[PDB]
Design a protein around this ligand. Structure first.
Ligand code: NAG
Ligand code: AHR
Ligand code: CA
Lengths: 243, 242, 49
């Protein structure tokens, strides 16, 4: 109460500060790289990363998908970005794929936060005709040190993943994630429960790989140690999640 | 004569342009002997519409000879519903300077509406008064009279970009506080001083000021005979002050 | 007063028991003729953020 200001005029700098806008980085992919005409439903996943972080709120972004690349417009998607987070995801579920238009096909996705519209032009993709099978995947395993091993002995697993049909050459990558369960832990549940929570994505249990536009084969490599003795067991299990 | 997007339609016949120019809508220009340019021609057109850009056409006859084959299309221009708003901001990198020293006074300008994308740039003359010198101009005529003679300067809005940057270097002479002011006036080639009208009815003054500090001196002594004798030579102390 | 730096004396007691033997001298202070002013300059290294 009793303190007295040293300077009567409140100071203002001889210059200013320019607080610019925050840009946006949009990247999108379709989970089935080669969807069938009515064989299943395709769910486009559209990730968006902000320029900077948030301050005591959860940013609401809106995703417009006016064009399918073949004629159609489903409802928009509302997404939220955490208080400290910078990235968020929109999901667009459509199943009515037709091979009427010759192809190759592409889409455009608009993202708005403060009424500023930022468009993203999707890469090309292809759709099979009705009645044909969806190209599945196959996985084989090779262990480097080979059985029998001991406790705390280095053990390397290599999972070779192939697709029955090559990824379309028009250009779209497939982000796959190998999640490997050692056979030592608490025996996790079915694959729906295999998606555990990881701190850093290139860790000893989760690995992220990318299937290139023109390829059909890849591999994911783990190198782990073992802790307890077991005669006749320790079956290494694996799953792939496309994200 | 001329027709810019104002009333009716263009005279789709060349002789129609001829009879329009020969009447009241025409105007005469004189080119004197041994001279390249013509005198300034001025038309006035009222707009009751709004919205996007427009493109007019001129036609010009010398002894019924038509310059330019169909017409001369004028540059892209746009009519607006509301007057565009100019905002300003100011900076000094040498915030405190001594007397007789250069100081960098920078301004950034933001326009409400963008410069027409298909049209030309927007040239504007900025007139800057440091605040320590004379009483400065008060009217727009005086503001536009501040030409490039170390006091005014012409900058340009890029077509489609709503930003401007301008700079001046006032070197104050007297100590204390000097607050500058700045005025923006469209710097076209037909920029008149009698009928100039500024964009900023309140002449923007930088909220801060410039501080001028007294000039210090350095002083160094030396004397000619480093071992003087008593009564034989007079000591000469040469003192130098910078 | 005016001119050079000055000093004061502060002496305390508890039931006639004296704190500090002669006194406790105060820190050096100077009395001014007029209120001094402060000249301030400001800067930003990332002028655009
Ligand atoms: C996607 O499809 C269009 C239509 O034929 C094609 O012209 C274009 O080159 C493709 N996109 C690529 C691979 O750049
Ligand atoms: O004339 C102004 C600029 O420079 C030239 C370009 O076409 C334009 O953008
Ligand atoms: Ca994990």
């Amino acid at each position: 109460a009793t303190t007295v200001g040293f300077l009567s005029p409140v100071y203002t700098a001889p210059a200013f500060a320019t607080v610019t806008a925050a840009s946006y980085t949009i990247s999108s992919y379709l989970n089935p790289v080669t969807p069938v005409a009515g064989g299943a439903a395709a769910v486009w996943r559209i990730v968006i990363t902000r320029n900077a972080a948030v301050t005591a709120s959860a940013k609401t972004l809106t995703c417009q998908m006016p064009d399918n690349g073949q004629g159609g417009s489903p409802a928009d998607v509302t997404a939220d970005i955490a208080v400290g987070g910078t990235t968020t995801v929109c999901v667009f579920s459509i199943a009515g794929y037709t091979t009427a238009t010759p192809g190759p096909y592409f889409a455009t996705v608009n993202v708005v936060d403060g009424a500023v519209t930022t468009s993203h032009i999707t890469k090309n993709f292809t759709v099979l005709a009705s009645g044909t099978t969806a190209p599945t995947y196959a996985v084989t395993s090779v262990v480097s040190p080979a059985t029998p091993v001991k406790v705390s002995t280095p053990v390397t697993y290599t999972f070779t993943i192939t697709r029955t049909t090559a990824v379309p050459a028009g250009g779209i990558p497939q982000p796959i994630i190998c999640e490997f369960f050692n056979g030592e832990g608490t025996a996790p549940a079915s694959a729906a429960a295999y998606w555990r929570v990881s701190t850093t994505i290139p860790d000893a249990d989760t690995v992220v790989a990318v299937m290139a536009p023109g390829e059909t084969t890849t591999t994911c490599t783990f190198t782990t140690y073992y802790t307890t003795v077991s005669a006749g067991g320790f079956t290494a299990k694996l799953m792939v999640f496309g994200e | 004569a001329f027709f810019g997007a104002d009333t009716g339609t263009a005279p789709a016949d060349l002789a129609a342009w001829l009879t329009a120019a020969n009447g009241a809508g025409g105007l005469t220009a004189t080119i004197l002997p041994s001279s390249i340019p013509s005198d300034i021609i001025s038309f006035t057109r009222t707009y009751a519409a709004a919205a996007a850009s427009l493109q007019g056409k001129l036609q010009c006859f010398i002894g019924s000879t038509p310059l330019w084959d169909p017409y001369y299309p004028t540059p892209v221009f746009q009519v607006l519903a509301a007057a565009p708003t100019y905002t300003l901001s100011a900076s000094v990198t040498p915030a405190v300077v001594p007397v007789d020293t250069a100081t960098l006074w920078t301004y950034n300008i933001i326009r409400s509406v963008p410069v027409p994308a298909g049209g030309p740039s927007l040239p504007i003359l900025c007139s800057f008064w440091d605040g320590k010198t004379g009483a400065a101009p008060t009217t727009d005529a005086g503001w536009a009279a501040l030409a490039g003679s170390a006091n005014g300067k012409g900058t340009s809005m890029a077509p489609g970009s709503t930003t401007a940057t301008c700079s001046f270097t006032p070197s104050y002479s007297t100590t204390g506080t000097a607050t500058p002011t700045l005025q923006l006036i469209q710097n076209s080639f037909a920029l008149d001083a009698a009928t100039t009208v500024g964009f900023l009815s309140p002449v923007y003054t930088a909220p801060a000021f410039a501080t001028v500090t007294a000039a210090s001196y350095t002083i160094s002594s030396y004397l000619n005979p480093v071992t003087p004798v008593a009564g034989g030579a007079a000591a000469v102390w040469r003192i130098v002050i910078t």
